[PDB]
Amino acid sequence: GPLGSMQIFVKTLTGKTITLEVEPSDTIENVKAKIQDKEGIPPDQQRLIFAGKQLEDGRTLSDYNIQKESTLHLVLRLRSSMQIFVKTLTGKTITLEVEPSDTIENVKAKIQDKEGIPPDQQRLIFAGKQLEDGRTLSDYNIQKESTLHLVLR
Amino acid sequence: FLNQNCAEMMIKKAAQLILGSDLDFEYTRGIQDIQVDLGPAFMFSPDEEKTLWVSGKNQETLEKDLATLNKSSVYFFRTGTQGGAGHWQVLYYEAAKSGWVSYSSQSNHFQVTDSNGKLTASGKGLLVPHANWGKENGNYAFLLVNASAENIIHAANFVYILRTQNEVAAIEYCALNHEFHPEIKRTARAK
Ligand SMILES: [Mg+2]
Ligand SMILES: [Mg+2]
Numbered sequence A: 001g002p003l004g005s006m007q008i009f010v011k012t013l014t015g016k017t018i019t020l021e022v023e024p025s026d027t028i029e030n031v032k033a034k035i036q037d038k039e040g041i042p043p044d045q046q047r048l049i050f051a052g053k054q055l056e057d058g059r060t061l062s063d064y065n066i067q068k069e070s071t072l073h074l075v076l077r078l079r080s081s082m083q084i085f086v087k088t089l090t091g092k093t094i095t096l097e098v099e100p101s102d103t104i105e106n107v108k109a110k111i112q113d114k115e116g117i118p119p120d121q122q123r124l125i126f127a128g129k130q131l132e133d134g135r136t137l138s139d140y141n142i143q144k145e146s147t148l149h150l151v152l153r
Numbered sequence B: 001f002l003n004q005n006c007a008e009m010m011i012k013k014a015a016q017l018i019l020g021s022d023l024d025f026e027y028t029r030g031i032q033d034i035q036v037d038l039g040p041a042f043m044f045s046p047d048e049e050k051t052l053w054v055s056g057k058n059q060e061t062l063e064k065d066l067a068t069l070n071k072s073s074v075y076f077f078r079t080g081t082q083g084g085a086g087h088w089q090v091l092y093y094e095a096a097k098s099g100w101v102s103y104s105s106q107s108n109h110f111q112v113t114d115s116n117g118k119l120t121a122s123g124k125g126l127l128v129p130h131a132n133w134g135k136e137n138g139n140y141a142f143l144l145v146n147a148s149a150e151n152i153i154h155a156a157n158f159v160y161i162l163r164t165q166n167e168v169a170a171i172e173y174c175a176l177n178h179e180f181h182p183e184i185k186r187t188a189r190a191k
Helices: A028-039 A104-115 B006-019 B059-067 B149-164 B167-176
Strands: A006-011 A017-022 A046-050 A071-076 A082-088 A093-098 A122-126 A147-152 B021-025 B050-053 B075-080 B086-094 B099-105 B108-111 B142-146 B184-188
Touching: A017 A028, A028 A046, A046 B167, A093 A104, A104 A122, B006 B021, B006 B086, B006 B099, B006 B149, B021 B149, B149 B167, B149 B184
Parallel strands: A006 A071, A082 A147
Antiparallel strands: A006 A017, A046 A071, A082 A093, A122 A147, B021 B184, B050 B142, B075 B086, B075 B142, B086 B099, B099 B108
């Protein structure tokens, strides 16, 4: 429309500040939708915090007195993560950052990142049992600081 | 009773080193016994107290980032990828071992560097040689957050309120408050 637009700033947990073109008329869900395009996050995982409070999707920027050049905080809905350890027969220990819902495949992918071993050549063992690519860490009750074993194939 | 107390143990470590204070988180039955991501606790931190490193592809560029750090400083230190699983640990210099240490919990910690500022076998564990490092989603990085008095207090309050209530209430508490929650007992100690 003819009023133009204004700039607000979404600050993130890294220190970065991302810039959006908006109007005071706009809702919080619209703003999350714009954030989706500009950095690649769906609305449902993001919380916008301003002047302390989490902002509700149905209220407007103007209702929150969110003015020209204001700063929102983008914070993500919390995921569970943990560290696990992968022992190789060489005796080296690889430390992975994982989620309980990670597939064994995802895990072999993180092992590749560290070791350059393609997932195809990896067999993983926990509690004496071979781990299947399509199951999850939680399916094998793999929990924080659990130790797996890597054998090549 | 408190299986997932990594956050409390890290925060106690930072408080001991920086504030000369032991913390005791006085919880009742019925708390969230879950892994806590500290990230949101640091949203209010000044920008100069949060720094992203992109050096973990190669031993020498990490050693260099580490060797820049002031050995009296303590950091909350996040490893992992930008979109994905992240793990927080405390980074401090233990003069007794002459090296940087990563402390995640009482059961998971390691010496990162030796007396001559080079990575140990465990410190080499931090490296991710076969993937890319940076600020974009899916890249590996390290996030260093100064464990200033203010960040230690925010982390402590965040965890306390998260466990006794939920994440939303903890974010809101940390926005309104800058002093240790009254139910987090502090006792002075030598440093
Ligand atoms: Mg990869
Ligand atoms: Mg005061």
